[PDB]
Each structure stands twice: as structure tokens, then as C-alpha cells.
Amino acid sequence: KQAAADRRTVEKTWKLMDKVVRLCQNPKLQLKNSPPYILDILPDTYQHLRLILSKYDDNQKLAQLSENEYFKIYIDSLMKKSKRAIRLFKEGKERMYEEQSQDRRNLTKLSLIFSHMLAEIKAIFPNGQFQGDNFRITKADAAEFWRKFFGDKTIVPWKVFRQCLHEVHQISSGLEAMALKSTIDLTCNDYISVFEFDIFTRLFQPWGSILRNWNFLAVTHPGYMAFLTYDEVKARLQKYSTKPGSYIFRLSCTRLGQWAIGYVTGDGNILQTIPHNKPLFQALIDGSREGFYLYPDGRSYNPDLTGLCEKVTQEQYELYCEMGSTFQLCKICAENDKDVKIEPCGHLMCTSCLTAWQESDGQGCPFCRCEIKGTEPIIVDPFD
Numbered sequence: 001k002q003a004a005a006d007r008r009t010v011e012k013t014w015k016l017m018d019k020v021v022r023l024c025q026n027p028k029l030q031l032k033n034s035p036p037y038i039l040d041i042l043p044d045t046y047q048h049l050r051l052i053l054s055k056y057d058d059n060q061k062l063a064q065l066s067e068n069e070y071f072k073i074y075i076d077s078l079m080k081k082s083k084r085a086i087r088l089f090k091e092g093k094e095r096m097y098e099e100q101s102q103d104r105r106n107l108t109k110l111s112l113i114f115s116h117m118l119a120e121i122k123a124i125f126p127n128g129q130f131q132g133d134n135f136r137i138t139k140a141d142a143a144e145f146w147r148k149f150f151g152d153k154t155i156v157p158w159k160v161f162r163q164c165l166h167e168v169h170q171i172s173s174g175l176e177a178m179a180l181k182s183t184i185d186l187t188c189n190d191y192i193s194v195f196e197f198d199i200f201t202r203l204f205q206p207w208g209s210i211l212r213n214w215n216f217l218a219v220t221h222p223g224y225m226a227f228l229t230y231d232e233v234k235a236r237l238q239k240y241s242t243k244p245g246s247y248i249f250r251l252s253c254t255r256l257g258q259w260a261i262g263y264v265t266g267d268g269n270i271l272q273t274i275p276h277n278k279p280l281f282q283a284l285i286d287g288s289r290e291g292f293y294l295y296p297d298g299r300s301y302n303p304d305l306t307g308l309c310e311k312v313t314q315e316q317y318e319l320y321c322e323m324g325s326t327f328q329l330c331k332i333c334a335e336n337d338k339d340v341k342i343e344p345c346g347h348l349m350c351t352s353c354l355t356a357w358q359e360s361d362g363q364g365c366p367f368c369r370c371e372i373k374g375t376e377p378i379i380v381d382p383f384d
């Protein structure tokens with residue numbers, strides 16, 4: 001349920017973004033200029049919102065823009081994320097100037113979110129004009145899935161997207177579905193846009209085996225490094241400079257939907273290659289046979305990926321989820337947010353799942369099996 005994105009509403013987001021910029025200009029933070037750089041992203045977001053308002057210049061156009069489903073979600077998401085950043089600095093206090101602190105980590109998570117939100121608004125409203133109903137999903141087979149389940153929709157709730165995906169590619173557990181939500185829902189707004197879908201389907205192509213490619217290359221592959229700057233890629237591989245063929249692959253916030261493979265050359269240098277619009281596992285296979293990519297993260301064992309041409313533990317999914325904003329999500333269903341607290345154990349889940357559990361004669365807490373002495377309605381945030 002979102003309010004209409006009228007001029008007054010869009011303007012509140014700017015004022016909130018202004019506080020986040022003022023907060024992030026403190027020199028005791030020492031933010032590296034490396035992207036995502038919040039001090040550039042927030043003004044660039046204001047500028048695009050301005051460029052959009054310049055196209056919907058009269059009351060007739062503003063009314064059309066206000067009721068745009070994706071735009072209403074965008075403004076509310078931008079506003080909520082902006083308020084979260086202000087709140088993060090308030091509660092964090094001096095922990096915002098300790099680089100290794102969880103409050104700082106949470107700010108890094110938001111910077112990635114604001115960065116993905118900018119690339120999204122720029123792809124959905126290129127030159128300030130709506131083109132979501134004209135967005136071209138890069139892989140035809142992936143596009144055909146979106147068209148079948150979601151028609152011309154630019155964005156659909158994660159709850160809806162997940163059940164439709166399961167119909168084509170089975171999701172085997174709640175934790176696997178939670179890892180999937182953090183991978184695809186990059187803007188952390190509980191919706192999947194056609195842009196986020198295009199990102200995911202380009203990275204883990206081909207569509208035919210998409211979840212096998214994701215489960216292997218991102219959840220369990222030792223060379224997978226999630227988003228990194230080139231500075232972080234070189235610092236990781238630096239310890240293996242004396243081992244030619246050592247490699248890692250990372251996502252890049254300035255090249256969404258593409259992989260960057262960093263590797264050690266025969267002469268000790270750390271270089272990188274951006275693969276074409278082809279499966280990342282094929283570039284790793286060709287690279288291994290040619291002698292360029294042999295040691296993932298400097299490790300001697302290179303997983304045989306040829307199985308992807310012709311099982312993930314719950315713990316592996318849990319570790320993969322750490323960078324995500326899914327703590328507020330019920331782990332049982334991975335589709336409703338946690339809205340109830342068990343007492344005295346304290347485990348949280350959604351009321352729908354607790355009800356399904358009690359109705360199945362499940363003994364005690366679904367998680368720890370301890371007696372439910374009582375329950376309490378609660379609201380959870382990803383950074384709790």
C-alpha cells in the first residue's frame with residue numbers, strides 16, 4: 001500500500017536525501033571515493049528525479065506520473081531507505097566512525113541499495129520519461145517467462161515472483177528462497193522490477209538451468225566475491241601474485257548484470273576481463289583449459305563446472321545471506337515478513353507460519369521446539 005507520488009511526496013525524499021548527504025560529509029567517516037559513493041549517488045538521484053519532473057511538466061502529466069505503479073514504489077522505497085540512513089547515524093552514534101562496525105556495514109549496504117536504485121530509475125525512466133512498459137529483457141527465454149507470468153508489468157511483489165519462478169525452476173527450501181530474494185531484489189524493496197529481473201537473468205544465464213548456475217557460481221563457488229571494487233580485487237589476489245592462474249570473479253556496481261574476472265598473469269600482475277553476453281561458467285571452463293583461470297581465490301582445487309553444460313547446505317545459504325537485508329523476512333516461508341515473537345524463546349516468524357505450525361500439532365517453537373508460553377506482535381527491520 002503506497003501513497004500517490006505527487007510533487008509534495010517526491011520533494012520530501014529530497015529533503016531526507018539532503019540529511020543523508022550532510023551526515024555522510026562528516027570527515028571522521030573517511031568514506032573511500034570508490035563506488036558506491038553515496039555523496040555522488042544521492043545528488044545524481046535528485047538530478048534524475050528533477051529530469052523526470054521536467055518531462056511531466058503540467059497537471060495532466062503529473063497525475064499520470066503520480067499513479068505510476070513503479071514510480072509510487074520507487075518514491076516510497078527511496079523515502080524509507082533515506083529515513084533508515086538518518087536513523088542509522090542516530091542509533092550508531094560513534095560506531096559510524098569505526099570502519100569495521102556493523103553500523104558502518106549497514107551504511108555500505110544502503111549505499112549499494114541507493115546505487116542500484118539509481119541505475120534502475122535511469123533504465124526505467126531514461127531521459128526522465130517512463131519506458132518500463134517498453135523495457136527489453138536481454139535474454140529472450142527469460143523475457144518469455146516474465147511476459148507469461150507478469151504480462152507488461154514493470155514490477156511485481158517478491159511474494160508473487162517467487163511462486164511463479166518455483167513453477168518453472170523449483171526452489172527446494174525457505175533458506176534457498178531467502179538467498180534468492182537478496183540476489184534478485186537488489187533495491188531491497190520486496191518487489192522485483194523488470195530491470196532487477198534482467199540483471200539476474202544476464203548474470204546467471206542460460207535460463208534453462210538458471211538456479212543451478214546461481215546455486216553453483218554464487219552460493220558455493222570459492223572464486224565468487226560478491227560486489228567488489230577493483231581496489232578490493234587487487235587486494236584479495238595480491239597474496240597470490242606468485243601463483244599465475246589465481247582468479248576471482250566479482251559483481252560491479254557500475255556494470256550491473258556483468259561479471260568481472262580478476263586474475264594473476266604469468267608475470268605476477270593482477271589484470272581483469274569482463275566476459276561477453278555468455279555464461280560465466282563457460283568463460284571459466286575456457287579460461288581453465290587455456291591456463292588463465294586455475295586457482296579460485298588462490299585455492300588449488302578448481303571446481304569442475306562442465307556439469308552445468310550437460311547440494312547446497314542450509315549453512316551455505318545462511319552465510320551467503322549475511323550481506324543481504326532479509327533479517328525482517330520470515331525464514332519459514334520466505335514470503336511474509338516476521339510479525340510475531342514467541343515467548344520465552346524469542347524466535348520470530350510470521351503469524352501465518354506460526355498458525356500452520358500449531359495446526360499441524362508441531363511441538364513448541366518451530367525453530368527450537370521449546371514451549372510457547374505466549375506470543376507478541378512485533379515489527380522487524382533488516383538491521384535488527
Ligand SMILES: [C][C]1[C][C][C]N([C]C2=[C]N3=C([N]N(C4=[C][C]=[C]C([C@]5([C])[C][C][N]C(=O)[C]5)=[C]4)C3=O)C(C(F)(F)F)=[C]2)[C]1
Nearest residue numbers: 035036105108109182183226227228229320321323324325
Ligand atoms: C562495492 C564495494 C564497496 C565497499 C565494500 N565492498 C564489500 C561489500 C560487498 N557487499 C556488501 N553487501 N553486498 C550485498 C548486499 C546485498 C545483496 C548481495 C547479494 C546480491 C545477495 C546476498 N549475497 C551476495 O553474495 C550478493 C550482496 C555486497 O556484495 C557489503 C556490505 F558492507 F554492505 F555488507 C560490502 C563492496
Ligand code: NA
Nearest residue numbers: 185187189191
Ligand atoms: Na527490488
Ligand SMILES: [Zn+2]
Nearest residue numbers: 330333350353
Ligand atoms: Zn512465514
Ligand SMILES: [Zn+2]
Nearest residue numbers: 345347365368
Ligand atoms: Zn524458539
